[PDB]
Amino acid sequence: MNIFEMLRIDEGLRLKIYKDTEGYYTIGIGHLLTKSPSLNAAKSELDKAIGRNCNGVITKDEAEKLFNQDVDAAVRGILRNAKLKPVYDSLDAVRRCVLINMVFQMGETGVAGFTNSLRMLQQKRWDEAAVNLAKSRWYNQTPNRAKRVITTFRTGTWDAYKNL
């Protein structure tokens, strides 16, 4: 199991513009297009992102290309961020993938806000950190995904995804 497979499980693949959980315009593997309520604003962003007139639809290959970019941007973001980098550096490989998963979903700024949790992961207090992460809007909104993520930080293995 690797980061790509893990995110492919959590986000799914969709070749036509759709609304994410929060109602935003998304495409492919969790690629947010715009927070704007306009489907047109959305289609414009898409063509800008793909380099072509897509008319709201993309190919598997294009989805995957956006996907490689997003994971890269996520990793580079953690590495450049002063609150995130140190935590990432302190973690084992599996747990490092988990932080990438969160950053991909909620953005660098969003994860950086989980001050207490970041401190606990750094100190390797797994159980305590799982309990604190669960106390968030994130968890309440996407409980099945959050639980997968949380269990992963908890045990350090891929069991939660081996099912899936």
Curated annotation (Swiss-Prot):
Effect of residue 26 to E: Complete loss of activity at neutral pH; covalently bound substrate
InterPro entries: Endolysin_T4_type, Glyco_hydro_24, Lysozyme-like_dom_sf, Lysozyme_dom_sf, Phage_lysozyme-like, T4-type_lysozyme
Binding site for substrate: 32, 104, 117, 132
Functional summary from the UniProt entry: Endolysin with lysozyme activity that degrades host peptidoglycans and participates with the holin and spanin proteins in the sequential events which lead to the programmed host cell lysis releasing the mature viral particles. Once the holin has permeabilized the host cell membrane, the endolysin can reach the periplasm and break down the peptidoglycan layer.
Protein name: Endolysin
Gene3D superfamilies in UniProt: 1.10.530.40
Consequence the record notes for mutating residue 117 to F: 10-fold decrease in enzymatic activity
Catalytic activities: Hydrolysis of (1->4)-beta-linkages between N-acetylmuramic acid and N-acetyl-D-glucosamine residues in a peptidoglycan and between N-acetyl-D-glucosamine residues in chitodextrins
Pfam families per UniProt: Phage_lysozyme
Annotated consequence of substituting residue 132 to M/F: 2-fold decrease in enzymatic activity
Active site positions: 11, 20
Organism field: Enterobacteria phage T4 (Bacteriophage T4)
An annotated Gene Ontology molecular function: lysozyme activity
Gene, per the UniProt record: E
Location(s), subcellular: Host cytoplasm
One GO CC term on file: host cell cytoplasm
Enzyme Commission code(s) on record: 3.2.1.17
Paired cysteines (S-S): none
Result when mutating residue 26 to H: Facilitates transglycosylation more effectively than hydrolysis; covalently bound substrate
Conditions for induction: Expressed late in the viral replication.
